[PDB]
Structures are given as C-alpha cells and as structure tokens.
Short mmCIF file of C-alpha atoms in Angstrom, two decimals:
data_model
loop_
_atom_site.label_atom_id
_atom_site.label_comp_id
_atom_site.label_asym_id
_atom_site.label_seq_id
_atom_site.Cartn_x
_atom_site.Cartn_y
_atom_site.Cartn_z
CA UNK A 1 0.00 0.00 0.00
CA UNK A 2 2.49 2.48 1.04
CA UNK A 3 5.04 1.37 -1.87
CA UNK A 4 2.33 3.01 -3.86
CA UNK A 5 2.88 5.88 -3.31
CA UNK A 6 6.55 6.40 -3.30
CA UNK A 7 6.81 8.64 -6.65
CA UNK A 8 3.92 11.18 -8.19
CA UNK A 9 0.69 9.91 -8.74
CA UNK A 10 -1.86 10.57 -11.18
CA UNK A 11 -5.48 11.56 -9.69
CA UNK A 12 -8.97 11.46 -10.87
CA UNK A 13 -11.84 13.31 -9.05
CA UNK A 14 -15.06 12.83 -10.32
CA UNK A 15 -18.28 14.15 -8.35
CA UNK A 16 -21.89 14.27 -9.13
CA UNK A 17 -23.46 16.71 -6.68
CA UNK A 18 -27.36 17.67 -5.43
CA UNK A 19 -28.06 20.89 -3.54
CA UNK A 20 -31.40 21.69 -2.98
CA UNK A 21 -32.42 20.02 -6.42
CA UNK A 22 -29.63 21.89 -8.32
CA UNK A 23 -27.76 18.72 -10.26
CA UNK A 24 -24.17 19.77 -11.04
CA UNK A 25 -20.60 18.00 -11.92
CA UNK A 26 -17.63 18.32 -11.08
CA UNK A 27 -14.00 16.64 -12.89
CA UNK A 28 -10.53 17.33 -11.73
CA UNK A 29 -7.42 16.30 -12.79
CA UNK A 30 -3.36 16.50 -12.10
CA UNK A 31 -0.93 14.98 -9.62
CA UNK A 32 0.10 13.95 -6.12
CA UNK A 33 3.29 13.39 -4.35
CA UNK A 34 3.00 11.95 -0.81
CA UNK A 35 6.70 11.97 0.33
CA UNK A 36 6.28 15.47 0.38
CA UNK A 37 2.51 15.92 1.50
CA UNK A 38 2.07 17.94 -1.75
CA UNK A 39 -0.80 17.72 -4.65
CA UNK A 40 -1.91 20.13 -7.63
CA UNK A 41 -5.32 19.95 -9.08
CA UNK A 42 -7.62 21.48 -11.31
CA UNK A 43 -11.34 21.14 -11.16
CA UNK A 44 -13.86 22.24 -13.60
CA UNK A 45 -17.89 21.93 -14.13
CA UNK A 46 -19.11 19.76 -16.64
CA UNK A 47 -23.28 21.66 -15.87
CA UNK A 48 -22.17 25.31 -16.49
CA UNK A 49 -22.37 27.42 -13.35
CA UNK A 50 -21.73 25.94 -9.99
CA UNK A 51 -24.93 26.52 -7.26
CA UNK A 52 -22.22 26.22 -4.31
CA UNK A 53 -18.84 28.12 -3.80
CA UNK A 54 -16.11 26.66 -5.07
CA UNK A 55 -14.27 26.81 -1.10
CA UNK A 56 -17.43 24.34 -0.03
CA UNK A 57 -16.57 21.58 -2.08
CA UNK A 58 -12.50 21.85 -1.52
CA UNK A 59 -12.66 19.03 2.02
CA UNK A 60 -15.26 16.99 -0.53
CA UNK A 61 -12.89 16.96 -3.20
CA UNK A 62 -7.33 12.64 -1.12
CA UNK A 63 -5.97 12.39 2.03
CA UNK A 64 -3.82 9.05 1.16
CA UNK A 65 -1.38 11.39 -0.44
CA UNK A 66 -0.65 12.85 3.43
CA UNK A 67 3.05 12.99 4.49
CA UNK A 68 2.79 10.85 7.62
CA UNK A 69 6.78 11.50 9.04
CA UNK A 70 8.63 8.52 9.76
CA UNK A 71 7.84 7.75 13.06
CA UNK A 72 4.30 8.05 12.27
CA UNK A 73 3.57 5.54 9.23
CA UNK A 74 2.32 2.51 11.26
CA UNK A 75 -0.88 5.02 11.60
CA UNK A 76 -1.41 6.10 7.89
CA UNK A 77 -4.85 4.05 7.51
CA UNK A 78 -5.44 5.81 4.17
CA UNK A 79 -2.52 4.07 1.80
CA UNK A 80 -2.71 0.88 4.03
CA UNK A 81 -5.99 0.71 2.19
CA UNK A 82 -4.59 0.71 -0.89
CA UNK A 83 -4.85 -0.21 -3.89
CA UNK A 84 -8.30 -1.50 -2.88
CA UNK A 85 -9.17 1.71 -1.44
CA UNK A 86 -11.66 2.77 1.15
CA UNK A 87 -15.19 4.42 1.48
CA UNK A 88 -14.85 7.88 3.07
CA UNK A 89 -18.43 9.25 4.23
CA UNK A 90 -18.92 12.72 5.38
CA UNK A 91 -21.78 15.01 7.00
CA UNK A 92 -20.54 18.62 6.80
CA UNK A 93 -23.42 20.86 8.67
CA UNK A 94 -23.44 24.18 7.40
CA UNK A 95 -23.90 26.60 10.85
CA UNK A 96 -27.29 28.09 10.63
CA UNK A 97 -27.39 26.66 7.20
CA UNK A 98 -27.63 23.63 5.30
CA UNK A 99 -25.86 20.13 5.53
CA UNK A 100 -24.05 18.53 3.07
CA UNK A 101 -24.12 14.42 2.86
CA UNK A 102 -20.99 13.06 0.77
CA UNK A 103 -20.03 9.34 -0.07
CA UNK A 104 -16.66 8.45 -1.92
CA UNK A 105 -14.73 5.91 -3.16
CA UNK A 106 -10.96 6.47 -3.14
CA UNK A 107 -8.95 3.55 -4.77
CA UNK A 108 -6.41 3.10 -7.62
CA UNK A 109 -7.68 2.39 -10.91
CA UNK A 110 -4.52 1.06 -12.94
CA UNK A 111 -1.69 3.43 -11.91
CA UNK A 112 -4.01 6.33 -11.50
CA UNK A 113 -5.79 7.27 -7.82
CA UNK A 114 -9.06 8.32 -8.03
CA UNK A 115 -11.49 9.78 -6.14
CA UNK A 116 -15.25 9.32 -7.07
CA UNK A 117 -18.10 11.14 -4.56
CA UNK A 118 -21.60 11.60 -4.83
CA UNK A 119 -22.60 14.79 -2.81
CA UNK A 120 -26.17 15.50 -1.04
CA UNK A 121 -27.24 19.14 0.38
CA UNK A 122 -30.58 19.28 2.05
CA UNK A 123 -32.14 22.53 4.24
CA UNK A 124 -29.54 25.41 2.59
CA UNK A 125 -31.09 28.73 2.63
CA UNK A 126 -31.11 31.07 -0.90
CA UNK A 127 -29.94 33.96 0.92
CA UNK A 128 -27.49 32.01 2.67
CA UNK A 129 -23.79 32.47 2.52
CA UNK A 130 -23.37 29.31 0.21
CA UNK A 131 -26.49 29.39 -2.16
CA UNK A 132 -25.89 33.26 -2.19
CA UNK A 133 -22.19 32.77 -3.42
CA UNK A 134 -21.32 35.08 -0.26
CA UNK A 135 -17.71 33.08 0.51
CA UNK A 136 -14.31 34.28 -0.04
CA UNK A 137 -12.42 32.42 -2.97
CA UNK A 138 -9.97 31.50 -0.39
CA UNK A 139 -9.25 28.94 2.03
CA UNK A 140 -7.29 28.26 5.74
CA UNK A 141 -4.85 25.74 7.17
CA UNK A 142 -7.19 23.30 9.09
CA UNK A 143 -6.24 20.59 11.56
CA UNK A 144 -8.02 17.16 10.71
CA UNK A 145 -8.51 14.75 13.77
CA UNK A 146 -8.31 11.36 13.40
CA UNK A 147 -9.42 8.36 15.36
CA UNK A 148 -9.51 4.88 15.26
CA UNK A 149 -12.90 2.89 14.30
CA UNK A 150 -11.74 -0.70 15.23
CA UNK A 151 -15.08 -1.75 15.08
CA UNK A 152 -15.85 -0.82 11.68
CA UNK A 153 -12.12 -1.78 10.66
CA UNK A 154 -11.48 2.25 9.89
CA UNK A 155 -11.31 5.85 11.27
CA UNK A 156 -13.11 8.37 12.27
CA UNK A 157 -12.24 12.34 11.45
CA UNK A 158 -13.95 15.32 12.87
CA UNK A 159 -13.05 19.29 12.29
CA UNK A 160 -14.43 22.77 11.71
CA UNK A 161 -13.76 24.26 8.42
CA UNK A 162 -14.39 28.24 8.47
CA UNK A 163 -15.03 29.45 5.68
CA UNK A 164 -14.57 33.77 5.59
CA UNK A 165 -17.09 35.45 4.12
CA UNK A 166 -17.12 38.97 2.04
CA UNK A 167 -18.49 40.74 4.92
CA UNK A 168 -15.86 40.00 7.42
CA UNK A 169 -17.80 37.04 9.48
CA UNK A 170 -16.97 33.53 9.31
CA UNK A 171 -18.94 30.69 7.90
CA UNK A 172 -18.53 27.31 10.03
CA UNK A 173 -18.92 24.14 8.90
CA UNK A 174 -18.71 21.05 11.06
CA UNK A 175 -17.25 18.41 9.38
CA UNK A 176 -17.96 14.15 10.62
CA UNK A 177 -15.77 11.39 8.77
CA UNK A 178 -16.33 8.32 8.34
CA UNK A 179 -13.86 5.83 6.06
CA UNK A 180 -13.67 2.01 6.11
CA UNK A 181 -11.22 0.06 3.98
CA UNK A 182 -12.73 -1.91 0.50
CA UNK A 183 -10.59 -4.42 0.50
CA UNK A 184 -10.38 -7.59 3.17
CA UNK A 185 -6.92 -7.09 3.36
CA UNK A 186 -5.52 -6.25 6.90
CA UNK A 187 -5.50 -2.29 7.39
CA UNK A 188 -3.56 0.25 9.89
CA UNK A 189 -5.52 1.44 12.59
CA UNK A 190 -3.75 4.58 13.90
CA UNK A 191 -3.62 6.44 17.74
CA UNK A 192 -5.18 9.48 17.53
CA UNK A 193 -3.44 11.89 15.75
CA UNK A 194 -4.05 15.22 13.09
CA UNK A 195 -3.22 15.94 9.59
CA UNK A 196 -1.84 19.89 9.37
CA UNK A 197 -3.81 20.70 6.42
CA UNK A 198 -3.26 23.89 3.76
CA UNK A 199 -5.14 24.67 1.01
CA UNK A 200 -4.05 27.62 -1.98
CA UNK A 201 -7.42 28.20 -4.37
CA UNK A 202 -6.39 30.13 -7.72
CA UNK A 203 -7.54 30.34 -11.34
CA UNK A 204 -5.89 29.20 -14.65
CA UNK A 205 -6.25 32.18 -17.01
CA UNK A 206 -6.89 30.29 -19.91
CA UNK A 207 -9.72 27.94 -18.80
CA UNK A 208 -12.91 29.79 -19.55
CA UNK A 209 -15.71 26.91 -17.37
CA UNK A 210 -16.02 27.72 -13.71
CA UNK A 211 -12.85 26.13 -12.21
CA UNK A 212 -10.59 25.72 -9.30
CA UNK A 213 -7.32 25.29 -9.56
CA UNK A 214 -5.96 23.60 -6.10
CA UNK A 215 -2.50 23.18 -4.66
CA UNK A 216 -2.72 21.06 -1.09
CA UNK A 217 -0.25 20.07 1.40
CA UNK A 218 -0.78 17.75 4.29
CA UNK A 219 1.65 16.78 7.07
CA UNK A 220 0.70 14.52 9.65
CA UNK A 221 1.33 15.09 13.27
CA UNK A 222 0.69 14.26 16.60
CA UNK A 223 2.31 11.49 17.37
CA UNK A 224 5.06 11.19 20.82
CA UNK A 225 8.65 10.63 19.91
CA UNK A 226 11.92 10.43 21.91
CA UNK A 227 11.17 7.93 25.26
#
C-alpha cells in the first residue's frame, strides 16, 4: 500500500453533486506526491455554473497522499488501504445553514488514484452564505482529527472548516468522517493523531468553465517521539 505511493501519482476526481435540487458535476485532474505531502489539481464543471462556492466543495474533493513523518507511518490508515481503497463518508453541517451528505470511493484504478463522490445538500437557505455565493475564494490551514474505528475496521475524522465570508464574518462548517477500507486485506488502525492541512485556491487564465485550480499540502502530526 504504502510502496504506492513512493513517486507522483496521477489523480482522478469525479463528483456528481445535489443541492437543494440543483444537479451539477464536477471533474478534476493533475498529480500527487505523498513523500512530500504535496498535490496540484484542477477542477472544472461539466453543468455550467456551480450553485455552491467553489471553497465548499475543496474538504469533498485525497488524504492518502498525506506525508505521515517517519515515526508516524504505522498510523497512515489511508494508503494501508490501498490499492483496494476505502469508502470515506462525510456530514458537513453548514452553521445556521444547510448540511451537506458526501459518499466516496478512493482507490487506484490502474496506476491512477481516483477519487469518485456523490454529494447530497438538504435545508440550505437562498440567501445564505453558500447558495448566495457570499464566501471568499480562499481557504485556511485546518487541523483534521483522526481516530480509530476498530469496530468498523477504519477511522473516524472530525473538524471545523471556516469558511470567511465577504463581509468579514466567518462561515462554520462542522465536518464528521467516516472511512472504512474496500478491501479484506488487513488495514492500519492509527492512535489518535491530526493531519496539518493547507489549502491555496487560484484560477488558470486560460480555462474559460467555472474552475478551481488547487495546490494542497498535508503533514501529519501528533504522534510522541523520543522515550
């Protein structure tokens, strides 16, 4: 599993989303490199305009390709799954808003990782900040928690993603994770731990569809050291 990962990786992300009836796709492309943590991708819709900010989507749309340091990699569930994959389930609850519902299937298809999610979003308001397109196209470093789920042979995640919004408040959205392996092959179950997570959202100048290009890097942390 972890020999997988040992050079750059191609990814796939493909996502069919619903949000309050409004049907939209999403595709992205490009490359990951877990030694260093590090991934580039671009994102575009395939259904014209996207309902939702781009920045609400970003946690929906990898985490195998974390850099787990050294002393750490006996608790890096995510390529222990692989190539098999895992299921990774969310409920992201939009404060005072709506909740999204995701469901994805990360696994390696030939040489290439990809990452295929169905998304849900019940109870958002129109004049909200994320039907209203009030978000910043911009996102911060978040801390992702992770326990172990021995009895469902996976993990467990849970963080708050703020998103800022144009008017100088903060949008919250509690995120609950959820991933078990495919495979029957024996997985790593880790001690709690986090994955320092950062996030730069920018625009390629020559793609004309609503896009989001997406550079990521992930280091996880946590874990005691030294006697």
């Amino acid at each position: 599993g972890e020999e997988l990962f040992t050079g750059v990786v191609p990814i796939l992300v493909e996502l069919d989303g619903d949000v309050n009836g409004h049907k939209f796709s999403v595709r992205g492309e490009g490359e990951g490199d877990a030694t260093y943590g590090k991934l580039t991708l671009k994102f575009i819709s395939t259904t014209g305009k996207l309902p939702v900010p781009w920045p609400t989507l970003v946690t929906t749309l990898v985490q195998c390709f974390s850099r787990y340091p050294d002393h750490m990699k006996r608790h890096d569930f995510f390529k222990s799954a692989m190539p098999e994959g895992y299921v990774q389930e969310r409920t992201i609850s939009f404060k005072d808003d709506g909740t999204y519902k995701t469901r994805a299937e990360v696994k390696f298809e030939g040489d290439t990782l990809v990452n295929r999610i169905e998304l849900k979003g019940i109870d958002f308001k129109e004049d909200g900040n994320i039907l209203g397109h009030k978000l910043e196209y911009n996102f911060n470093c978040h801390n992702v928690y992770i326990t172990a789920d021995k009895q469902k042979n996976g993990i467990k995640a849970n963080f708050k993603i703020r998103h800022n919004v144009e008017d100088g408040s903060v949008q919250l959205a509690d995120h609950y994770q959820q991933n078990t392996p495919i495979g029957d092959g024996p997985v790593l179950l880790p001690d709690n731990h986090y994955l320092s997570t950062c996030s730069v959202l920018s625009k390629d100048p020559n793609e004309k569809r609503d896009h989001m290009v997406l550079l990521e890097r992930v280091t996880a942390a946590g874990i005691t050291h030294g006697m």
